């Protein structure tokens, strides 16, 4: 049939690929089209630090924990292939430093070799007295998106540069099903008082010698409002801010300083690092991910809509699990229409 | 007095700086000259992989077990300094993969977070059934030599490009003490059957996405006759050859393929790595490191000679603990000769 996906970030292209991948063989014309106002370099996904790591706190809707676990194994299974890196995927080991002892996270068994830090190791970070170590995966937002768009292109999925004004618009257009993957920018399509922006800023730097990631935590100031250093495919992401309710899209020198001096006390060799860029992004902060089916009708119309947005600061980390879900709900639409 | 150090590799320059730091403030005129027929870019130390790791096999002269540990505490103690990376030092984590279980190494507790690989992680390396994981350090020999030469230069230590034909030649040159740090070429100045070269070849590639080190072991081929991938400051080192008794300084086309094919089977993503260099060096293969005193009376002369060579594949790994040793034997001399 005719499927339209609004959104070209990790969640949108991920959901698309997954859908076409599992139903193209049964559906006659399966017309999948992606609409989005901004693409690749300009999505929230490219500004991502590119690390697999759910929050240190448990989620409401434990259904999100299984989605994180799914993504990990999907990505881990490519850690074999010769094209893993072209996808923006690669293994990394690192630390999560704390000022006081905290309980283990619920994902301690999802990652590789998680263990508490020994005394010697903490002497490398005098400012912290507690912490963990483990190996995870790197999913460079920028590169992963190019790969996803390429995989789709070959499958016949078409890309349109357009800012959808409302569902009806796409509906009239002729979409039988609509996949809403518009991140923090939802609301504009349908009001959602629960979906707010979580402004984050990062500095891109050239420190090829930094091979391990380091995330620090200030349990008083909130998650990611503490300096972190995350190496990527060929640049290191320096970060430290998470401001809720802030729609300011411009780099703030006020934050520039916090991140830089915060990261330079943590890793003094950064004084030689060369800044390659500074970007700002809005995490789709929502008390819970919205992933459900909704029936919107317009007289003789009756269009189908499936949502999948509001993944806060764990979009890359949970993307695939969420995608499998949508595909599953998409399967129940065909069933309801007698399509198998 | 006059101390003449023969050898400008990691063992010579280190011993040089160690002697200076400890006795400079006491001996009236402390002359220190370093002679070498080949410098930095061209020493065996510049061809090193850079990993801090002794052989898996138990040692001989448990004396080496402590020189290794000293050297590690020396290097680790630089991880907080802003000059760590400019010395060629940075932390790395990695794997040691085997085809069958083997006893733990004696240095297991010398490094950080040592542990055995689990089933999941093994599925990442299909050809191996056992392994360890631990964090260590990179001591890029290249950077380290330039770093030491600068530190020595600001200290008054003069360098001389001169090939030493005999110890006598130097004892007559006007030198009271001699530190023999001539590497695999020591025998040329005093026959030594126990010493032989351990030729090895290595491929320098550009694969910045590789963050961890991978070392495979083929128990039936000896040591480092299995591939290994060691990420460096800004280039990655491919390797896997150990040929004792071979003195060819040129690259063997076959050895190139044993390394390349083997590392690609281990790490598929290499197919897109752009080779940057290939080198060949000879490890100072000796059943035991030779660090000892040897008076050499040359008619009235009487020069003291201290030997520090034959470190095979663990020169960088054990350098500092040896220099600390030369400095003490030198203390003795200083005392007997009664300059203190
Ligand atoms: C600084 C920073 C670092 C981060 N680091 C990490 C990390 O390490 N790991 C992690 O998992 N997560 C991280 N995140 C969060 C992660 O980036 C997000 O969860 C993820 O990008 C959300 O994906 P998305 O689908 O919302 O897509 P987005 O890319 O945000 O948006 C997809 C598309 O929606 C389109 N769109 C929106 N409105 C409309 C409209 N009206 N019409 C048409 N198209 C529209 C956009 O044009 C866009 O292309 C980070 C976030 C920030 C800000
Ligand atoms: C491929 C490869 C990889 C390696 N990887 C590692 C690793 O990861 N970790 C590790 O710890 N070790 C490694 N090693 C071993 C390490 O490189 C050696 O143990 C170390 O370089 C030995 O130092 P050296 O003191 O012998 O110095 P070298 O640099 O070999 O020699 C020092 C000096 O001796 C001078 N010299 C010799 N004879 C004379 C003479 N007659 N007159 C004047 N000057 C003379 C030379 O000119 C030179 O400047 C590796 C070796 C190889 C070949």
From Swiss-Prot, chains A, B:
InterPro entries recorded: D-amino_acid_oxidase_CS (IPR006181), DAO (IPR023209), FAD-dep_OxRdtase (IPR006076)
Main location group: other
Description of post-translational modifications: Phosphorylated in the cerebellum; probably not by PRKACA, PRKCA or PRKCE. May be S-nitrosylated, which partially inactivates the enzyme.
Region listing for Required for protein stability, in residue ranges: 1-16
Induction cue: Repressed in conditions of amino acid starvation in an autophagy-dependent manner.
GO cellular component labels: cell projection; cytoplasm; cytosol; extracellular region; peroxisomal matrix; peroxisome; presynaptic active zone
Class in the EC hierarchy, top level: oxidoreductase
Binding site for D-serine: 224, 228, 283, 313
Entry keyword annotation includes Transcription: no
Gene3D superfamilies: D-Amino Acid Oxidase, subunit A, domain 2 (3.30.9.10), NAD(P)-binding Rossmann-like Domain (3.40.50.720)
UniProt keyword terms in alphabetical order: Cell projection, Cytoplasm, FAD, Flavoprotein, Oxidoreductase, Peroxisome, Phosphoprotein, S-nitrosylation, Secreted, Synapse
Entry binding sites for D-proline: 228, 283, 313
Subcellular location per the Swiss-Prot or TrEMBL entry: Peroxisome matrix; Cytoplasm, Cytosol; Presynaptic active zone; Secreted
Pfam families: DAO
Region entry Active site lid that may open upon substrate/product migration in and out of the active site and close to increase the hydrophobicity of the active site, to make the hydride transfer reaction more efficient, spans: 216-228
Cofactor: FAD
Residues noted as binding FAD in the record, renumbered to the chain: 8-11, 37-38, 43-45, 49-51, 163-164, 182, 283, 312-313, 315-317
Listed GO MF terms: D-amino-acid oxidase activity; FAD binding; glycine oxidase activity
BP GO annotations: D-alanine catabolic process; D-amino acid catabolic process; D-serine catabolic process; digestion; dopamine biosynthetic process; neutrophil-mediated killing of gram-negative bacterium; proline catabolic process
Residues that, per the record, bind D-dopa: 53, 283, 313
Reported tissue expression: Expressed in the liver and in the kidney, including in epithelial cells. Not expressed in the lung.
Extra remark: Variation of pH perturbs the enantioselectivity of the enzyme towards some amino acids.
Family: Belongs to the DAMOX/DASOX family.
Function: Catalyzes the oxidative deamination of D-amino acids with broad substrate specificity. Required to catabolize D-amino acids synthesized endogenously, of gastrointestinal bacterial origin or obtained from the diet, and to use these as nutrients. Regulates the level of D-amino acid neurotransmitters in the brain, such as D-serine, a co-agonist of N-methyl D-aspartate (NMDA) receptors, and may modulate synaptic transmission. Catalyzes the first step of the racemization of D-DOPA to L-DOPA, for possible use in an alternative dopamine biosynthesis pathway.
Protein name: D-amino-acid oxidase
